Amino acid sequence: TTECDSKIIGTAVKNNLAIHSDLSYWIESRLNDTWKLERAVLGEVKSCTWPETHTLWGDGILESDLIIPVTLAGPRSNHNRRPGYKTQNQGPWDEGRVEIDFDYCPGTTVTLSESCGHRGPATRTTTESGKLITDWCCRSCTLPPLRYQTDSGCWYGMEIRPQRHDEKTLVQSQVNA
């Protein structure tokens, strides 16, 4: 509802690399085959609006296509996008520091299947007991998978659900932005 402080902000694109940053955020999209989000470092999740004046490539954008929620200071930018993933309103935003990228969580695998569960709250790869969940899946996402990294463990994007639908103690995000 409010706008972020534009005194500590810096957005720059040069050659094949684009970066929307400030003191807490470092949002990097790269041109490889296509322009897409490569890595987002969120030192501490904000709750403001990223100013359009410091936004690259923000023409005709549907907010539901933006990986990082605009309400969480996500830039209204086509750089803030990734094929196969809608907006991550239910990511682990209440874990403090969070780092999004596109790679596999250690010991885990992600498979494409229409059988897989529909997108839900972001689930951590380790249970409350600390047991690792190895088999994951998705219906219509792309690989490598959307991965969160917080101080409490490694998470997957909303689209990605545990393949063994039968997990007992799941650690899932409780926030909805």
Partner 1 sequence: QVQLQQPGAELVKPGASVKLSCKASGYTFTSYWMHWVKLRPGQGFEWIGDINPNNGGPSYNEKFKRKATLTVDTSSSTAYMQLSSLTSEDSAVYYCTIDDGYRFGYWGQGTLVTVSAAKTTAPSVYPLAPVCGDTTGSSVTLGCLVKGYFPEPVTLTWNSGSLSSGVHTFPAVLQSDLYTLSSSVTVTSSTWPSQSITCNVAHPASSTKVDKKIEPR
Partner 2 sequence: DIQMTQSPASLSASVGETVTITCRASGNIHNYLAWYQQKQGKSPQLLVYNAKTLADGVPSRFSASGSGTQYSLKINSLQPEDFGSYYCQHFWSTPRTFGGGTKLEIKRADAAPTVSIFPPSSEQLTSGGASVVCFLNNFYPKDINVKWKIDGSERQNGVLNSWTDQDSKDSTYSMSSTLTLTKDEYERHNSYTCEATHKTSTSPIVKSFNRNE
> Contact 157/122 with Cβ under 8 angstroms?
yes
- At its nearest, how many Å lie between partner 2 and the CB of residue 60? 4
Going from the C-alpha of 111 to that of each of 34, 37, 75, 145, the distances in angstroms are 23, 21, 30, 9
Name the nearest CA neighbour of 90 among 20, 128, 146, 153. 146
Going from the C-alpha of 126 to that of each of 24, 27, 34, 173, the distances in angstroms are 27, 26, 33, 13
Kindly tell me which of 127 and 142 has the beta carbon lying closer to partner 2. Answer: 142
By CB under 8 A, residue 7 contacts a copy of itself = yes
Residue 44's contacts (CB-CB under 8 Å, 6 or more residues apart) are 24, 96, 97
By CB under 8 A, residue 149 contacts a copy of itself = no
By CB under 8 A, residue 82 contacts partner 1 = no
Q: Point out which span in 53-61, 67-75, 88-96, 117-125 binds partner 2 (CB under 8 A).
A: 53-61
Q: Of these partners, partner 1, a copy of itself, partner 2, none, which one is at the site of residue 11 (CB under 5 to 8 Å by kind)?
A: a copy of itself
Segment 69 to 98, residues that bind a copy of itself, using CB under 8 A:
76, 78-79
Sign of the dihedral through C-alpha 92, 136, 64, 56: positive
Residue 64's contacts (CB-CB under 8 Å, 6 or more residues apart) are 86, 87
By CB under 8 A, residue 64 contacts a copy of itself = no
Kindly tell me which of 26 and 104 has the beta carbon lying closer to a copy of itself. Answer: 26
- At its nearest, how many Å lie between partner 2 and the CB of residue 112? 9
- Paired residues of 29 in beta bridges: 18, 37
What residues line the site for partner 1 (CB under 8 A)? 62-65, 83-84, 86, 89, 118-120, 139-141, 158-159, 176
Which residues of this protein are in contact with a copy of itself, per CB under 8 A? Answer: 7, 9-15, 18, 31, 35, 52-59, 61, 76, 78-79
